[PDB]
């Protein structure tokens, strides 16, 4: 699944 943590 797409994961976005910045």
């Amino acid at each position: 699944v797409q994961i976005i943590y910045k």
Partner: antibody
Amino acid sequence: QVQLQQSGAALVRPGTSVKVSCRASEYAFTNYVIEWVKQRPGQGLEWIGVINPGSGGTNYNEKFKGKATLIADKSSSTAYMQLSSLTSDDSAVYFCARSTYYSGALDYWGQGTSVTVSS
Amino acid sequence: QLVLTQSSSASFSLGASAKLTCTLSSQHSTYTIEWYQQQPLKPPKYVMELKKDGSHSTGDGIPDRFSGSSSGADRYLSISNIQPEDEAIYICGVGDTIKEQFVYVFGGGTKVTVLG
């Protein structure tokens, strides 16, 4: 107006290093990140990386490790991108852009800073 | 692995309907992408966020003639009643957290010309 104010045009010599500035105004600087994008004249967009002002945490496109350094100053609401070991390859418009911690969208962009590497 | 494939730079009549295609790498078929619009000499502008189910959110200053839809790995930008100010390159972007590092990638962009 949520605004990102970038430093002005730069004409620099090969082998030097330049520092572009991105000043945030009229938005909570530490509730968002700053991403940087490279555009070579008449070429597409190339993602450089992201600074999280709030954490200091950085993420970089592999191609730019040792090339680009991203730093943030909370007190001045300012993000900086330094470019090292400059060549003609590094000649481009550099954009700063606002994005969220958890989403893709570069929802607002700076005007661009034209870095020319020339003798 | 994370790749965006943009459809051919095209030419649409003033007031006609345009559909651009951004196709995701097959394993990333569920991913949300962003559309961007770059007019001459101007910084790119955020156009919308577009999810696997066709649900979208348009950015600051984007007219209601820009919408989106999805079909498998295809992420589409629809412009109805295309206007001269819509003339630009349209660029898709996608993020993921790979090798434990965040990465953003751009499509190569589609040059939208408005004829007439």
